[PDB]
Write an enzyme that holds these catalytic residues in place. Structure first.
Site, PDB file in Angstrom:
ATOM      1  N   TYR A   1       6.204  13.381  13.088  1.00  0.00           N
ATOM      2  CA  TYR A   1       4.945  14.636  13.900  1.00  0.00           C
ATOM      3  C   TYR A   1       5.726  14.534  15.128  1.00  0.00           C
ATOM      4  O   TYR A   1       5.656  15.590  16.011  1.00  0.00           O
ATOM      5  CB  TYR A   1       3.783  13.454  14.711  1.00  0.00           C
ATOM      6  CG  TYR A   1       2.511  12.899  12.934  1.00  0.00           C
ATOM      7  CD1 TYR A   1       1.863  13.975  12.580  1.00  0.00           C
ATOM      8  CD2 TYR A   1       1.995  12.186  13.111  1.00  0.00           C
ATOM      9  CE1 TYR A   1       0.834  13.708  11.761  1.00  0.00           C
ATOM     10  CE2 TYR A   1       1.393  11.638  11.558  1.00  0.00           C
ATOM     11  CZ  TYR A   1       0.969  13.366  10.845  1.00  0.00           C
ATOM     12  OH  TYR A   1      -0.014  13.255   9.747  1.00  0.00           O
ATOM     13  N   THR A   2       5.896  13.302  16.080  1.00  0.00           N
ATOM     14  CA  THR A   2       6.997  13.824  17.597  1.00  0.00           C
ATOM     15  C   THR A   2       8.170  14.191  17.063  1.00  0.00           C
ATOM     16  O   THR A   2       9.042  15.149  15.532  1.00  0.00           O
ATOM     17  CB  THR A   2       8.150  12.408  17.589  1.00  0.00           C
ATOM     18  OG1 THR A   2       8.915  11.613  16.921  1.00  0.00           O
ATOM     19  CG2 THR A   2       6.930  11.780  18.398  1.00  0.00           C
TER      20      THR A   2
END
EC number: 5.6.2.2
Lengths: 1117, 99, 49, 98, 49
Positions: free
Chosen positions: B70-71
């Site tokens: 996600y990051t």
């Protein structure tokens, strides 16, 4: 008139409002059965977005109304309702049978056209047909499960009423049965398959027992203590009551109250009249300690209260709170008199229900005492270090964001406006409270943190007045874990904090679904596909630019967004749109929650299969569409359903069931594709495993190395796979408890058979989809040039679905495929009988034996069977004359070290006799050698048989031939597994030939351009030299030679070395060869016979080179 | 740096930087690698952050960073000064774990 | 540390900066625990705003 | 265990090492590029005969040996002329080399 | 993993780390006179224990 704001009438312009259209039409149709004029109500869901509601009542009054126009038009156009249904519909039809005639009236955009008088008929009733307005509603697709749940409920409330639901928006291959079989469909003859083409999902609900059948339904999943359901009625002046109740072993209150069939979820006068009378009767029967509270008696109780009031008065946030003060007195009188009658007549049942309440009373007393010891032991209170409070002290202005700590904990705490927004990061796992008792529920630290944050308390000590936040926002991810957490938070609220939902305090965050990453312009946010498409169109027509691959980001996790993004898009009250959780029916929601979060694995497995693939419908409402703190209401029934199906399918596809075409799960396929793209071929030196794990991780499967390395190792182990797909170098463990060495030490490459799984994948033979970040592409399925699913088998268990396909012999499977290719027109029975007989049975990598053929036969013709596996034992005699049994073979997947341990544990416990010692003398040179020394006293044969009986030396293989077929989980017969595989093979060959032909014509085009340049080489070179820039040399070349821009680039990029005599001829030679290749490629496309031969010849080549001898011997008895 | 996750180019998912490190230089778990990346991105950890992150990188408290998938991450211009002309034989190189 | 007086006239301390590597959440918990244990006095509440 | 001056000096010593190694590499690759460019210049001046040599030649290996003898060049210089694309024969691209 | 030989003079015990060469030592060996003890846990420091 109504069209201006749907809201003040239908609720929302989405699912809630769409279902509210059906409810009103069904309510006035059911009103006939309550009056005693209708016996059958039939509901039809049409493919064109229409709904047909038919009854056999009296029929809508056709007679001339006092105003001038007929009554039928007055009820349909003028308010005071079904007039709102016509107002928010494009077309409404009414087929009334009243006064001994067949009337007909059509409404075009709410306006009437005329009441036509038809054929005379003595029978009475009315039929309503309506098509929802696509310009008004956001979606026009009705949910079958929601409609069926309310009808089943409506049939429970009316004894003499039968409801027949029909859904036309169904494909002829879709799972439609409420009770889905765990076995495959019988083989259909060519006749019965063809006769059907020259299907509709249907359900029937008729309950003569009324509310007794309702209580039986509630206490089906729950374990009823007493085998006698209470049943009584009471008639008043302008009212009537019917109550049915039965206690269960569970620890939850399942009391559903209704007024004129409408579900009174907020309760009221009738529920309060019952509650007070129940506690009065129960406590009086006790014959000295403190009085039993209502909570203690109602705990583990299933009851239905159905009142029929002539003039009903309503209260509460929703119109579902009965306030008729005369009904409290009436229900209490009927209850006190009939409850005492049951408690006296059934004393055997009465003793256990009082004792269940006594146990419950002592449970809360002990909890309060234990609470009081910790309560007074100068504590600040609250959740310090957990909860990030807001500055505001006013609940009205206060908002709480319940978020998964790992998802948006830090970013939400940073992005938020700390003046009125508080954050609760869930730093653990929310338990499933569905069948859990309040003690186990309060033992969960996350559940307790929620209760502390809200300040209300729970069930007994609940107080809505003590609520700290008037907005409770659930901020979960749009991924498998996020959807799972949503189901768990919704279960907690419905079962333990229902008034928070009802009073409109529970909300769901609406984060962006897309981020449009424009090259120059600021990134845009889309909350739907229609918004994305609209923003993408509008900005292309404003001349903006965007990358066709990684240009539109699809959000799966809130953690992808910066604190600023997260605030601006989903937390800011000026631009956000929160999704308010509503509870429209507590009885229907109880059924849905009980099915999905309960313990009935069957009803769960059945629900997932009939909802697996999205409904085949033309949603015209999503094609067309016509304040600060914005709120959009969503129903708990619809939202919970969406969430659970999304979660279930993600774990089913992801790690449980393999795709029928290649027999792989995403992980394995991703490892294999990553290794392939890296060039880790059998003809090249081994690469360290870390390299393959990292390639898979960064591009296809962005999770922990362990899961990826697990797939690699399992595909490498000669005891795990019958035909290994990974060629390992180093320590890959043992069939025992020895694990592989670290991924930085072991080496891996693809096997020659793995190269046959990936054969011509670069030749557009399979559908590719964008990967996790949308930057590159990954295959949906591998070419699988050998029948891998059957050859190598597959396991896996997720949310009520379990698979167990055993490995097989490639040579045997090849014959089944060869027969299927040649006899491509044969029916289901002829194929089944041919595949069985060619493939003798399972063939395990761990050799061994199969005892009998019944289980093997059952698994092939039904998709389910018990195949008895047996290892091989040898008898040895040493120097002294001492006998020892040598285990040389074992059944499939039985762990060597665990097998040795079980025997040792049984011998010391005296459960296994005659054994004096066990040793593991196994090695590569000696094979499997588990030496079991036997006492001189013991007989070898009698010890071996005891080892079969009490150890895994003889174990069964529970075959469940379940796999993913076109995205849906299906239990299949052997012929179905072979045919689906063959279809993929023919698809791979046509897709291969198509690609090869396109690239041959592209090469020929280029080579023709180079030939033109070679024919006039002198003037070509002179043109480039004379020209100042590269572009004039390019433009001059297009004019000199009759060529295009692509050909000019081939002449310009041509290296000076290519001008040699042997190099000029290379172009001339290559171009002439292409036209022969083209003719042959075009010949394959035109001949399906040739394509079938290509599959046959290429499989035979694989089988001749990699096929091997059978390992498992098939013996009888 | 080798991957080209530089300030002039868009952030790449942190999993891409973790995998590239893991496969070619640090062949251990993803956790130890993602821990380095995160701590070099956190403005409360580094006085001069070396990783420029997109998404949830946690908080100075007990809030962990979001999953590496996600990051997103890239080098900061300060990190570019760390690697400046490393391709110009400015430092001694040695063969990696698999030579 | 900053000082504030609210609408009621109640006094509260506001930590605006902390030393290097001190975990905010652990800092709040130590105060909360030390108040509970009676080791720390004069504090009625702690909030992360 | 170091003092601030030791921490500062060892760093400054590393920075001086980086600059001497950067200048060495840059000088080596400048001479390397120039050697190849000198070959291209030789070929550009004698283009008619260079093109005619390759065209008349049978194989690329019998073409390289002739190119080494035609222009006063080596194996590395001759290969760069063979790998030179037709688009580089444009006036501004010929001048770009110069 | 035991060896067939009962003679200590002829017998050999290979003490290995399970994660390192548990599987490979058990497979590679001559099981007639070579035994394998894979260490599946952590050996404690017995110096001052």
């Amino acid at each position: 008139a109504v069209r201006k704001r749907p809201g003040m009438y239908i609720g929302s312009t989405g699912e809630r409002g769409l279902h509210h259209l059906i409810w009103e039409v069904v309510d006035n149709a059911v009103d006939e059965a309550m009056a005693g004029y209708a016996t059958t109500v039939n509901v039809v869901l049409l493919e064109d977005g229409g709904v047909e509601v038919a009854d056999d009542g009296r029929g809508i009054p056709v007679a001339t109304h006092a105003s001038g126009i007929p009554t039928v038009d007055v009820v349909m156009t003028q308010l005071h309702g079904v007039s709102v249904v016509n107002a928010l519909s494009t077309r409404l039809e009414v087929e009334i049978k009243r006064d001994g005639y067949e009337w007909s009236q059509v409404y075009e955009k709410s306006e009437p056209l005329g009441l036509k008088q038809g054929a005379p008929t003595k029978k009475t009733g009315s039929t309503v047909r309506f098509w929802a307005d696509p310009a008004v509603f956001e979606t026009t697709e009705y949910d079958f499960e929601t409609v069926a749940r309310r009808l089943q409920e409506m049939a429970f409330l009316n004894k003499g009423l039968t409801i027949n639901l029909t859904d036309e928006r169904v494909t002829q291959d879709e799972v439609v049965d409420e009770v889905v079989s765990d076995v495959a469909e019988a083989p259909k003859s060519a006749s019965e398959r063809a006769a059907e083409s020259t299907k509709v999902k249907s359900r029937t609900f008729h309950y003569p027992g009324g509310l007794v059948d309702f209580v039986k339904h509630i206490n089906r999943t729950k374990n009823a203590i007493h085998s006698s359901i209470v049943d009584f009625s009471g008639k008043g002046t302008g009212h009537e009551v019917e109550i049915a109740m039965q206690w269960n072993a569970g620890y939850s209150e399942s009391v559903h109250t209704f007024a004129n069939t409408i579900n009174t979820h907020e309760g009221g006068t009738h529920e309060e009249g019952f509650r007070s009378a129940l506690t009065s009767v129960v406590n009086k029967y006790a014959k000295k300690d403190p009085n039993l509270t209502g909570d203690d008696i109602r705990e583990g109780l299933a009851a239905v209260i159905s009142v029929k009031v002539s003039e009903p008065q309503f209260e509460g946030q929703t119109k579902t709170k009965l306030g008729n003060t005369e009904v409290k007195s009436f229900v209490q009188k009927v209850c006190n008199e009939q409850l005492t009658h049951w408690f006296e007549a059934n004393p055997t049942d009465a003793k256990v229900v009082v004792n269940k309440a006594v146990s419950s009373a002592q449970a809360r007393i002990a909890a309060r005492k234990a609470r009081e010891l910790v309560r007074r032991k100068t504590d600040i209170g609250g959740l310090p270090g957990k909860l990030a409070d807001c500055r505001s002290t006013d609940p009205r202005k206060s908002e709480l964001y319940v978020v998964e700590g790992d998802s948006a904990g830090g970013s939400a705490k940073s992005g938020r406006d700390s003046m009125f927004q508080a954050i609760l990061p869930l730093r653990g796992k929310i338990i499933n409270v569905e069948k859990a008792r309040i003690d186990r529920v309060l033992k969960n630290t996350e559940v307790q943190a929620i209760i502390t944050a809200l300040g209300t308390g729970i069930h007994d000590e609940f107080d809505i007045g003590k609520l700290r936040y008037h907005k409770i926002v659930l901020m979960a991810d749009a991924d498998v874990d996020g959807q799972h957490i949503s189901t768990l938070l919704l279960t907690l609220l419905f079962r333990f904090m229902r008034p928070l939902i009802e009073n409109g305090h529970v909300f769901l965050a609406q984060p962006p679904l897309y981020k449009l990453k424009w090259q120059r312009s600021d990134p845009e946010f889309a909350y739907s596909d229609r918004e994305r498409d609209g923003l993408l169109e509008a900005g292309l027509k404003a001349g903006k630019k965007i990358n066709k691959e990684d240009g539109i980001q699809r959000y799966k996790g809130l953690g992808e967004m910066d604190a600023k993004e997260l605030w601006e898009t989903t937390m800011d009250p000026s631009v956000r749109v929160l999704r308010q959780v509503t509870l429209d029916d507590a009885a229907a929601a109880d059924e849905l929650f009980s099915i999905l979060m309960g313990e009935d694995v069957d009803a769960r497995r059945s629900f997932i299969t009939r909802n697996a693939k999205d409904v085949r419908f033309l949603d015209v409402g999503d094609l067309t569409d016509t304040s600060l703190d914005r709120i959009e209401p969503v129903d708990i029934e619809q939202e919970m359903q969406r969430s659970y199906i999304d979660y279930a399918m993600s774990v089913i596809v992801g790690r449980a069931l393999p795709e029928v075409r290649d027999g792989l799960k995403p992980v394995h396929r991703r490892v294999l594709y990553a290794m392939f793209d890296s060039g880790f071929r059998p003809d090249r030196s081994h690469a360290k495993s870390a390299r393959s794990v990292a390639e898979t991780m960064g591009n296809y499967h962005p999770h922990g190395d362990a899961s990826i390395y697990d797939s690699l190792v399992r595909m490498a182990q000669p005891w795990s796979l019958r035909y290994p797909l990974v060629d390992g170098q180093g320590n890959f463990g043992s069939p025992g408890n020895d694990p592989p060495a670290a991924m930085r030490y072991t080496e891996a490459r693809l096997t020659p058979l793995a190269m046959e799984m990936l054969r011509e994948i670069d030749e557009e033979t399979v559908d590719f989809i964008p990967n996790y970040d949308g930057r590159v592409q990954e295959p949906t399925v591998l070419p699988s040039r050998f029948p891998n699913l059957l050859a190598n088998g597959s396991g896996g268990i997720a949310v009520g679905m379990a698979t167990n396909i055993p490995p097989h012999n490639l040579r045997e499977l090849a014959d089944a495929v060869f027969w299927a290719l040649e006899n491509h027109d044969a029916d289901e029975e002829e194929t089944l009988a041919a595949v069985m007989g060619r493939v003798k049975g399972p063939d395990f990598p761990t050799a061994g034996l199969i005892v009998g053929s019944q289980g093997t036969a059952d698994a092939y013709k039904t998709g389910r069977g018990s195949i008895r596996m047996r290892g091989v034992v040898e008898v040895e005699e040493d120097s002294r004359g001492r006998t020892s049994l040598v285990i040389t073979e074992l059944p499939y997947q039985v762990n060597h070290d665990n097998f040795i341990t079980s025997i040792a544990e049984q011998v010391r416990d005296g459960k296994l006799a005659g054994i004096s010692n066990i040793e593991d003398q196994s090695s590569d040179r000696v094979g499997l050698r588990i030496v079991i020394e036997i006492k001189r006293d013991a007989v070898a044969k009698v010890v071996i048989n005891n080892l079969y009986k009490h150890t895994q030396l003889q174990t069964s293989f529970g075959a469940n031939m379940l796999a993913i077929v076109d995205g849906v989980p299906r239990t299949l017969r052997l012929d179905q597994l072979i045919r689906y595989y063959v279809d993929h093979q023919l698809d791979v060959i046509v897709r291969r030939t198509t690609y090869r032909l396109r690239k041959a014509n592209e090469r020929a085009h280029i080579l023709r351009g180079l030939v033109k340049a070679l024919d006039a080489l002198d003037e070509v070179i002179a043109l480039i030299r004379a020209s100042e820039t590269v572009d004039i040399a390019r433009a001059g070349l297009i004019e000199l030679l009759d060529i295009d821009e692509i050909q000019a680039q081939a002449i310009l990029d041509m290296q000076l070395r290519r001008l040699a005599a042997l190099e000029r001829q290379r172009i001339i030679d290559d171009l002439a060869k292409i036209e022969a290749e083209i003719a042959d490629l075009e010949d394959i496309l035109a001949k399906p016979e040739r394509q079938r031969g290509i599959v046959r010849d290429e499989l035979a080549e694989i089988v001749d080179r990699h096929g091997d001898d059978r390992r498992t011997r098939i013996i009888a008895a």
